[PDB]
Every structure is written in structure tokens, then in C-alpha cells.
């Protein structure tokens, strides 16, 4: 769950991601109109001065804001989730939590990487780098861009041609990654850094295209594994499943992404890539991003 003021700032950020029929940013009046609610109610929700948020209001807001199935789930929980009297306790500190995920992906002989609350890539083992054949210059120049290490920059960016790698599977893979991005980021949409991140991602024509279409999907894949099956332009026929595990920290969530091989040729490819040089993890986006 969330405090009323934080939830209010979330509604404001979600509203401001929209443009009406005349291309204007949605005002409180427009959100009021689309939800058939009084402007004062939208005003009180956004200021966090409304103690109780009933189901009709929340459903009207989720419907008007055209949230994805994954976003609806996160949005409703941010509004109705019971906050405990005692603050959450964690076995490991944020630093020990990331180090624990790094120590684990270092020991895997399959591609594995870590993302945070903005879906920025925090760390990756060298098997991931070798598998995706990421130019080392693109890693070197990622600190110079606000969206430089974002998973959406890899999938939808112009510098690395991910569409070429997955080929005919592009629509499916881009749809799934858009669903993941939108459901994971839902809780941090009012963050100044997220607003900046979204504006940079919106400069990519293909990101915008999949973003505006995302709510039309009737099937949710954001909380599920994706089974990749395609002819890779250089590795040939591959078959593998990507899994995402989440861990909570006092500085926001951490996600671990792993790719399990599902064919002898994919098994052999991952085994060859784990052999090359040795087991190592490359540090990418700094974490926590704003450590305080
Ligand atoms: C350019 C900065 C990031 C450098 C390395 C990132 C490695 C992560 C690869 C991400 C591709 C995953 C997308 C997918 O499987 O659908
Ligand atoms: Cl390649």
C-alpha cells in the first residue's frame, strides 16, 4: 500500500501522461469528466485529503486512466493495501541484497541480470553480454543518457537493434516487455527521475507505438515467464524461457532475470558462452539510484 499523499501524487502523474482529443495534457477537470466524479473529489485524491477511497472511485480512475491489467493490480493495491503499524523489516540491507543477487548471477551458467524499480539494468553476468552481443562502446556511453541503462532502451532503442535479433517474434517480445515495464514502474510513476526517463523513452517511435497500444491487451504476461522460440540470425534455432524474481529492499525492489535453456542447441550455446574467459558480473546503472 501507499500513504494518501503519495497515492495522490501517483494519480497526478498518471493523469499527466495523457493527452486528450485536442492533444492537451489532461487536467483535473478532464479526469473528473472521464470518471463522472466531481473536480473537488479529483482535487482531494491528488492532495491526499480523502481518507477513504471506495471501489467505485478506484475502478472509475483505473478505467479512465486506461491502465494495463498489470497496472490495475498495482494501482488498486497502492490504494487499498493495509500499511502495518511497524515499518517493514529485511534480513539484508539494500547493499547486501544487491550483492546477494550479484553473487548468485556470477555463479549461473545461463544469461542473468538485475533490474530495479525503474527497470534500469543494475548488473549482468558476462554470459548476458556475450549472448546479446552488446557493443562495449554502447555500455561505455550509457552513463551519458538518463535512459542509458534502461531495459526499454535495449528493447526499443535505435543504438542496439533488438528487433533484428528476435525478428518475426518482435511484436510479441515488445508487447511483453512493455507490459513488464508498465506494471513494474506503476508505483514510482510520480518520481521525478521516472518522468525524465519516460520523456526520453517517448522519443523512440517504436516505444510510443507499443506504449499507446498496451491497454488494448486482454491477456496479461507481466507476472509470467516468457517462452522464446525463434531462429536467431546468428545462433540459429533457440528455445528458452525468461523468468523474473523480485526481492524487496528498504530502497525499492530488485528483480532478477534468468534465461533457462529448453533445447539441446540452446543448452550447448549457453554452456559455450559460460566457458569463454570466465564467470564475472558487469556493474551497470548505479544502485540505489538516489541513495537517500
Ligand atoms: C546498454 C546498457 C545495458 C548493457 C547490457 C544489458 C544486458 C541486458 C540485456 C537485456 C535484453 C532483455 C530483453 C528480453 O529478453 O526480452
Ligand atoms: Cl547478435
Numbering used by the authors: 0 to 291
Sentences from the paper on this structure:
MltR functions as a dimer, where each monomer consists of an N-terminal DNA-binding domain with an HTH (helix-turn-helix) motif and a C-terminal PAS-like (Per-Arnt-Sim) domain, which is involved in ligand binding. MltR consists of two domains, a small helical DNA-binding domain (DBD, residues 1-80) and a larger α/β C-terminal ligand-binding domain (LBD, residues 92–291). In conclusion, we have determined the crystal structure of a novel transcription factor that is a representative of a large group of regulators with significant implications in antibiotic production and fatty-acid biosynthesis.
The asymmetric unit (asu) contains three monomers (1.5 dimers), which are similar to each other (average rmsd 0.7 Å for 289 Cα atoms). Each monomer contains residues 0 to 291 (residue Gly0 is the residue that remains after cleavage of the N-terminal purification tag) and one fatty acid tentatively assigned as myristic acid (MYR). In the first dimer, the two monomers (chains A and B) are related by a non-crystallographic two-fold axis, whereas the second dimer is formed by monomers (chains C and C’) that are related by the crystallographic two-fold axis. Each dimer is arranged in a side-to-side arrangement with the DBDs at one end and the LBDs at the other, resulting in a relatively flat arrangement with molecular dimension of 75 Å × 73 Å × 48 Å. The distance between the recognition helices (H3) in the MltR dimer is approximately 34 Å, enabling the two recognition helices to fit into successive DNA major grooves by spanning ∼10 bp (1 turn of B-form DNA), and recognizing a two-fold symmetric DNA target (palindrome or pseudo-palindrome). Although MltR was crystallized without the addition of any substrate, additional electron density in the putative ligand-binding site clearly indicated the presence of a fatty acid-type ligand, which was modeled as myristic acid (MYR) based on clear, interpretable electron density. The cavity is not accessible from the protein surface by molecules larger than water.
